[PDB]
Each structure stands twice: as C-alpha cells, then as structure tokens.
Design a protein that fits this description.
It is found in: Host cytoplasm. GO terms for molecular function: lysozyme activity. Substrate binds at residues 32, 104, 117, 132. Belongs to the glycosyl hydrolase 24 family. Helices cover 65% and strands 9% of the residues. The protein contains eleven helices and three strands. A hairpin with a 5-residue loop joins strand 1 (14-19) and strand 2 (25-28). The N and C termini lie close together (11 Å). The longest helix has 21 residues, at 60-80. The protein has one domain: Lysozyme (Orthogonal Bundle). The chain is mostly helical and 164 residues long. It is elongated, with a radius of gyration of 16 Å. Helix 4 (84-90) runs parallel beside helix 7 and helix 8 runs antiparallel to helix 10 (143-155).
C-alpha cells in the first residue's frame, strides 16, 4: 500500500461528474470541482481543469492525472504549513499517508485546526490521538473512512485497508 492506493480505495473512481458526500460536484478520484450548486459551473471548472470541452465526462488517464496533481497539492500544503509540517516530519511513512489522506479530504486549513490531535500525534501518543481524532464532525459524517484513517494513525500499519 501507498498513498495512491489508499486514496483510490477511499474516494473511488467515477468518470462522470458526481456529487461527493457533502453534495458537491466532483469527478475522478475525489477531485472537487466546485461548491456551487450549479452543474454548469462545475462543467466549466472541469473543462478548465482538463483543458478541453469535456461535457462532464473524462477518461481514466485524465482522472489519474488530476489525482496525481491533487496528491502533490496535499503534500505541498502540508510542507508549507507551519502547524502541519513539523507533525508530518515527525511521523513514519505509513502515518504520513494518513496525514496526506486527511489533507486530501478536508484541505490544509481544516486539518491544521485539529490542534490537540496534531500535538498528540507529534508526541506519539497514538491511542490518545485516535480518541481525539474521532471527536470530530469528520468522524461523525464519514465514519467508515475516518475509522480507517484513524486506525492507520493508531497502529502505523495498513491493517484497515487490507480487507479493503
């Protein structure tokens, strides 16, 4: 397992515009297009992102390219953020994937707000971090995915993704 396989499991792959768990227009492997309720706005963002007139549909190669861009952006968001970078740098490789997953789902600013969880992660207090991470809208709204990401932080293993 690696971060691409992990997020591919958590986000799926859809080649036509869909709504994500929050009702926002999305495509591919969890690529958010817009929070606007307008499908036309989402189609415009799609064409801008892909560089052609897509009419709401993309290829698997195009989805994978967006996904590469989005993972890269999540990692860069972590490295540029003064709250996130030291915690990330402190982690092992498996737990770094859990961090990237959170930033991919909720964005850099959102994750940087998890102040107490971040401290517990930096201190390697894994069970405490796991309990704190679950005290969140994130966990309550997407509990199966949050449970997988939290188990990954708790254990430093891929056990939550191995059954799938």
């Amino acid at each position: 397992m690696n971060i691409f396989e992990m997020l591919r499991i958590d986000e799926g792959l859809r080649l036509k515009i869909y709504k994500d768990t929050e009702g926002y227009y999305t495509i591919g492997i969890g690529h958010l297009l817009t929070k606007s309720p307008s499908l036309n706005a989402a189609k415009s963002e799609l064409d801008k992102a892909i560089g052609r007139n897509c009419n709401g549909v993309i290829t698997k190669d195009e989805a994978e390219k967006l996904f590469n861009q989005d993972v890269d952006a999540a990692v860069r968001g972590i490295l540029r953020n003064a709250k996130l970078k030291p915690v990330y740098d402190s982690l092992d490789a498996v737990r770094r994937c859990a961090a990237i997953n959170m930033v991919f789902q909720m964005g850099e600013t959102g994750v940087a707000g998890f102040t107490n969880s971040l401290r517990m992660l930096q201190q390697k207090r894994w069970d405490e971090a796991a309990v704190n991470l679950a005290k969140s809208r994130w966990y309550n709204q997407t509990p199966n995915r949050a449970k997988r990401v939290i188990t990954t932080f708790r254990t430093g293993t891929w056990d939550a993704y191995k059954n799938l």
